[PDB]
Write a protein that binds this ligand. Structure first.
Ligand SMILES: O=C1CN(Cc2ccccc2F)CC=N1
Length: 330
């Protein structure tokens, strides 16, 4: 089997991407944030505290003839940005882009933190990291990919995120029309439950490439590119008037600037992030200070190849017995 779904930026800055997902019988279509940095499929629901729902579409398990309570199971998750959610669990039929999994754990939110409530465009998350991070207790549950894997034509999914435009998530096949040149594959460590890999270095604009190992995660659920402070300082030093602002919470730059590109290494290959991808616009409406898309990871404990980096590539998440990542230009 295969599946193919379009993913759409939630706003003009590409802050996140939403992908429609069919849940239940008859189908209830929710727009989920596909997150390769977590492993829970959770939704706004008929159980969510009413004051914490503000425009999201909800899953109502009582209207699904295939929904079953997963008796005794609870979940609770906290994300890198300080957001959280928790609740109880159903199993139900879940389809993405024509690919169907029966018996998928659908984590129903009873509580969500303010950042979720305040985002009307995201109806929940679909985790695509390794199932070892799934938070369901007392019986840990599998991701949608792990449940689909054995049925897929090839045990892979691909992320093809657009810059200020829709893109695609494919399951079970590699669309050889979707990228230029060849795919370079690189080793993955699953020890922390992430798609963790080691970049071979970076360049800033037309500058020389610096060969240096940068361990980090491929994370579709993180907006920005978080790298070591040395690398980030080297980038922003090429932008007149850029500075790290403790009050704003990262590097800002004059909105009048033209940003240089940023290149990262994948083995002997190179992915170029155009400068425009690094502009996240005014810090507040009408400001001439703009927020940067490359930020320090120093306060995180891990480097994160988030959407700013991934949207510059066609990315293969290879779930073979020994997982690997692939990157191609596009
Ligand atoms: O990397 C992230 C992911 N997400 C970004 C975001 C920002 C503004 C509005 C919506 C949105 F999803 C939440 C925080 N950090």
């Amino acid at each position: 089997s295969t599946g193919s779904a379009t993913t759409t930026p939630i706003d003009s800055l590409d802050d996140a991407y939403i992908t429609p997902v069919q849940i239940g019988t008859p189908a209830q279509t929710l727009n989920l944030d596909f997150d390769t940095g977590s492993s829970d499929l959770w939704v706004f629901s008929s159980e969510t505290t009413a004051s914490e729902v503000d425009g999201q579409t909800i899953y109502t398990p009582s209207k699904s003839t295939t929904a079953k309570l997963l008796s005794g199971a609870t979940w609770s998750i906290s994300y890198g940005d300080g957001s959280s959610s928790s609740g109880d669990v159903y199993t139900d039929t879940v389809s993405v882009g024509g690919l169907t999994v029966t018996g998928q754990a659908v984590e129903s939110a009873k509580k969500v933190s303010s950042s979720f409530t305040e985002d009307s465009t995201i109806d929940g998350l679909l985790g695509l990291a390794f199932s070892t991070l799934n938070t369901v207790s007392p019986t840990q549950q599998k991701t949608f990919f792990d449940n689909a894997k054995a049925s897929l034509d090839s045990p892979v999914f691909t992320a093809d995120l657009g810059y200020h435009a829709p893109g695609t998530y494919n399951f079970g096949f590699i669309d050889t029309t979707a990228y230029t040149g060849s795919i370079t594959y690189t080793a993955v460590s699953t020890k922390q439950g992430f798609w963790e890999w080691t970049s071979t270095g970076y360049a800033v604009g037309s500058g020389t490439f610096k060969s240096t190992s940068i361990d980090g995660i491929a994370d579709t659920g993180t907006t920005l590119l978080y790298l070591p402070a040395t690398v980030v300082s080297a980038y922003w030093a090429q932008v007149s008037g850029a500075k790290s602002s403790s009050s704003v919470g990262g590097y800002v730059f004059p909105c009048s600037a033209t940003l240089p590109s940023f290149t990262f290494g994948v083995g002997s290959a190179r992915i170029v992030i155009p400068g425009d991808y690094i502009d996240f616009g005014p810090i507040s409406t009408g400001s001439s200070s703009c927020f940067g898309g490359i930020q320090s990871s120093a306060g995180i404990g891990i480097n994160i190849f988030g959407d700013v980096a991934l949207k510059a590539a066609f990315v293969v998440f290879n779930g073979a017995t020994t997982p690997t990542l692939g990157f191609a230009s596009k």
